Structure 1
Amino acid sequence: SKPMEVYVSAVASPTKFWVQLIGPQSKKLASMVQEMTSYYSSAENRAKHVLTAPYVGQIVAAVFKFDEKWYRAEIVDIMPNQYNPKEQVIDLYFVDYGDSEYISPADICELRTDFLTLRFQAVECFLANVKSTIQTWPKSSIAKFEELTEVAHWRKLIARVVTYKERPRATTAVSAAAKEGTPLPGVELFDPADNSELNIADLMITQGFALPL
């Protein structure tokens, strides 16, 4: 397959992270985040889209109070508030970035229909040809991978899909697009501005943060 320019947008570990494609799609995503954020920042517009009787699988708009921006999100679970049985806590998967967060319904709206047009931008991947140094990944390995990818800071990488692995049985709530048996792409990654001929897997192995195979 062909190499592709990507950003790493979220990281759980070197064998669970998310990438976005750079190009017209990433420009459209940035434009959409701006437009959704401007639109839903108005109480009047939010009232046009009040959330009622939400359901698992629903695609919604949600504000992440971190950056105060509005994002497309998939409801992956709904549970009662523990303090308060008459309200729910909503498990959201942020379809364009890869993050998952538990969010109050107060911070969610229905998604205006035209915001559905853009392809969901995040693809879950694993780093091919590596495994953990200790038989889970050490926090230091996760940190090194976050550093090399500069996750969430718009660092261009070159990715290539070189293998696939069957998704394991999930132990937590995940996207409807990420069920057991579906193919998880295994990628090579390298930083074209890196000063190195080695890809990120080989950097992690040669520097003691991962093992081969």
Structure 2
Amino acid sequence: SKPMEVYVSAVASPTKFWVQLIGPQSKKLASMVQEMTSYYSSAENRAKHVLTAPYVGQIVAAVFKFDEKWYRAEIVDIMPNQYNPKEQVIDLYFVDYGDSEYISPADICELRTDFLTLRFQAVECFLANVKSTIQTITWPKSSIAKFEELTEVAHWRKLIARVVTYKERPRATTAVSAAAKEGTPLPGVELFDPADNSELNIADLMITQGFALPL
């Protein structure tokens, strides 16, 4: 299949990360992050959308602590606050970026309906043709750091991705997103940086610098 321009938007490991496709939809995403952030920054607007009795699977608006911007999120789990049983703690999945955070319900609002239009932008992927250097599954922190560096995750670095394989999703050991429960396979991709001067793509770079092993 054909190559596509992407950003790597979030990383768990080289075999679990998220991409956003660059194009009309990424421009619309950036615009939506702007509009949502402007909108939900007003208390009147937030009161138009006060959260009551949240539930798993609900799509909401939430503040991201690290940039004070508002994002679409899916409630993946809800548990009692252990200090404070009168409150809950929410496990959120940011549907357009792919990262997850635990959040207080005080930082969540109902999502204004027209913000649902744009399709969820983050696509979960794994890096094709690699496996961990640890064989006794887990990646060394140095390998994760290296992958984060090569992708420049969350710094808007254009990469070229190509889907070259698929694999079944592992059975879940934690609460997961509704989409991760639909039977859809995970795409395994080649990734390369058109701006780095290497002919090697990111898999081959990681393998030849001892950060990964070939499959």
Q: TM (normalized to structure 2)?
A: 0.98
Q: Give the C-alpha shift of residue 64 in structure 1.
A: 1.1
Please identify, of 176-185 and 91-100, the stretch whose mean Cα deviation from structure 2 is larger: 176-185
Q: Give the C-alpha shift of residue 180 in structure 1.
A: 7.5
Q: Give the C-alpha shift of residue 179 in structure 1.
A: 2.2
- C-alpha distance in structure 2 between counterparts of 1:174 and 1:155, whole Å: 28
State the secondary structure of the residue aligned to 1:178. helix
Please identify, of 175-184 and 110-119, the stretch whose mean Cα deviation from structure 2 is larger: 175-184
Aligned residues of 1:168 and 1:181 also touching (Cα < 8 A): no
Percent identity over paired residues: 100
Please identify, of 167-176 and 126-135, the stretch whose mean Cα deviation from structure 2 is larger: 167-176
Structure 2 residue runs of 5 or longer lacking an equivalent are none
- C-alpha distance in structure 1 between counterparts of 2:154 and 2:175, whole Å: 23
Pairing 1:99–2:99 present? yes
Q: Give the C-alpha shift of residue 181 in structure 1.
A: 4.2
Superposition misfits of 4+ residues, deviation over 4 angstroms: none
Q: Give the C-alpha shift of residue 171 in structure 1.
A: 1.2
State the secondary structure of the residue aligned to 1:196. coil
State the secondary structure of the residue aligned to 1:143. helix
**Cα pair distance change 1:106/1:91, threshold 3 Å:** same
One of 196, 199, 211 as aligned partner of 2:198? 196
Q: Give the C-alpha shift of residue 170 in structure 1.
A: 1.1
Query: How many equivalent residue pairs?
Result: 213
Q: Give the C-alpha shift of residue 99 in structure 1.
A: 0.6
Deviations 1:105-134 (A, max 9, x none): 000000000000001000000000000001
- C-alpha distance in structure 2 between counterparts of 1:155 and 1:28, whole Å: 18
Deviations 1:29-60 (A, max 9, x none): 00000000000000000000000111100000
**Cα pair distance change 1:94/1:60, threshold 3 Å:** same
Deviations 1:131-182 (A, max 9, x none): 0001200000000000000000000000000000100111122111012843
State the secondary structure of the residue aligned to 1:120. coil
Please identify, of 89-98 and 172-181, the stretch whose mean Cα deviation from structure 2 is larger: 172-181
Q: TM (normalized to structure 1)?
A: 0.99
Residue pairs, 1:41-120, within 5 angstroms: 41-120=41-120
State the secondary structure of the residue aligned to 1:155. coil
State the secondary structure of the residue aligned to 2:98. coil
Structure 1 residue runs of 5 or longer lacking an equivalent are none
Q: Give the C-alpha shift of residue 96 in structure 1.
A: 0.2
